[PDB]
């Protein structure tokens, strides 16, 4: 054939990949502490002899969007929201250290703090709270525990949440949705991120997802139009080859 | 030699028919959840290579083997499915629909081209037998 069909076909398939990324972003429009994935087409030119005429296209995801999200006021002392460019630290699935923005902190029957089922990490490691005690979280992450039955004079600090500062260019979303330091950024900032004392959190507010609707809509419209354009090129190339095959007769 | 063109073009026709069959099988089973063994349907692909064993560089086309794709099987969340893993994820085929459609059309076009080559060579061999009346 004329491999021009293999260019428009790639452009049509990567458009479906982009649509699958955008639809995934739209599905998580209500996920607490969600970071939308950025999608971008990139052109790769095929090198060779003689005339460079073919340039294929692939969909890539250049990190995520770190724009602080919406803040819903839920009058719950455990749901916390972070200052812009600030991350909470939890223990990842494989016993590693991961970063998140979901402040929906839950207390188990044994007293351990968890986020989405992952243990919460402080300066002393995972945080264990006295069993069945009221928890208040300060602006700088200090945790006060009140034991029921005892007077409010008993309120004393227990542990401090680990709050780190990381930009978009330094973190990469792992396969389980937890952000981790990229290789270059890890090599310069060390393996574990030191807690930043300047990070402030707000207790009683939960951060929503930063999925922008207007950009999503425009992206879907553009993707549909591009897919139709590639289909019209594919049809034209197929029609051309069908007659060109007549040259072999007689 | 015009006679070897028969073998060359027949090999090409058979190989392109196999490729189109693989593409049609992939298109049909793009939404299959399971197979007889309980394993997901993996997209199949043919392997084209020349067959010029008796000291030649060009000898036509033959399909060495049919191989299953190594691209990632699509994971869908479904905890009630008997085939779901520990996390509740079910594996689904990695078929590229647009790719298989383009493969169907391209296989048909090159199959037709080889048909035309065979017809032309047959006509030339028919005309040869009348050399000098």
């Amino acid at each position: 054939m004329d491999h021009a069909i293999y260019t428009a076909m790639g452009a049509a398939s990567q458009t479906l990949n982009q649509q699958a990324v955008t639809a995934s972003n739209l599905a998580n429009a209500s996920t607490p502490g969600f970071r939308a994935q950025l999608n971008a087409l990139r052109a790769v030119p095929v090198d060779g002899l003689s005339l460079a005429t073919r340039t294929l296209v692939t969909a890539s995801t250049p990190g995520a969007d770190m724009t602080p999200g919406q803040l819903d006021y839920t009058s719950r002392p455990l749901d916390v929201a972070l200052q812009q460019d600030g991350w909470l630290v939890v223990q990842a699935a494989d016993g590693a250290e991961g970063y998140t923005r979901n402040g929906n902190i839950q207390v188990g029957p044994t007293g351990q703090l968890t986020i989405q089922g992952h243990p919460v990490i402080g300066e002393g490691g995972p945080i264990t709270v006295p069993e069945g005690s009221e928890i208040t979280i300060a602006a700088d992450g200090t945790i006060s525990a009140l034991n029921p039955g005892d007077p409010p004079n008993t309120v004393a600090p227990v542990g401090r949440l680990k709050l780190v500062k990381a930009e978009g260019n330094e973190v990469q979303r792992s396969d389980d949705g937890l952000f981790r330091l990229t290789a270059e950024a890890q090599a310069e900032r060390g393996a574990v991120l030191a807690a930043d004392p300047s990070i402030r959190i707000m207790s009683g507010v939960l951060e929503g997802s930063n999925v922008k609707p207007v950009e999503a809509m425009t992206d879907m419209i553009a993707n549909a139009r591009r897919f139709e354009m590639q289909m019209k090129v594919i049809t034209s190339v197929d029609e051309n080859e069908g007659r060109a095959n007549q040259l072999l007769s007689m | 030699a015009l006679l070897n063109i028969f073998d060359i073009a027949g090999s090409a026709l058979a190989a392109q028919s196999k490729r189109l069959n693989v593409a049609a099988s992939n298109l049909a089973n793009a939404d299959s959840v399971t197979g007889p063994d309980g394993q997901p349907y993996r997209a199949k692909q043919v392997v084209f290579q020349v067959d010029a064993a008796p000291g030649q560089a060009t000898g036509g086309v033959k399909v060495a083997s049919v191989i299953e794709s190594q691209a990632p099987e699509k994971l869908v969340y479904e905890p009630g499915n008997p085939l779901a893993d520990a996390n509740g994820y079910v594996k689904m085929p990695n078929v590229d629909v647009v790719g298989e459609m383009v493969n169907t059309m391209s296989a048909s076009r090159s199959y037709q081209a080889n048909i035309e080559v065979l017809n032309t060579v047959k006509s030339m061999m028919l005309k040869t037998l009348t050399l000098g009346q």
Binding site: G10 | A64, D96
Partner: peptide, 16 residues
Amino acid sequence: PGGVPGALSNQPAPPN
């Protein structure tokens, strides 16, 4: 000497 004749060999891929 050859490979998959179509979509799976005409798409960009990371190197091995």
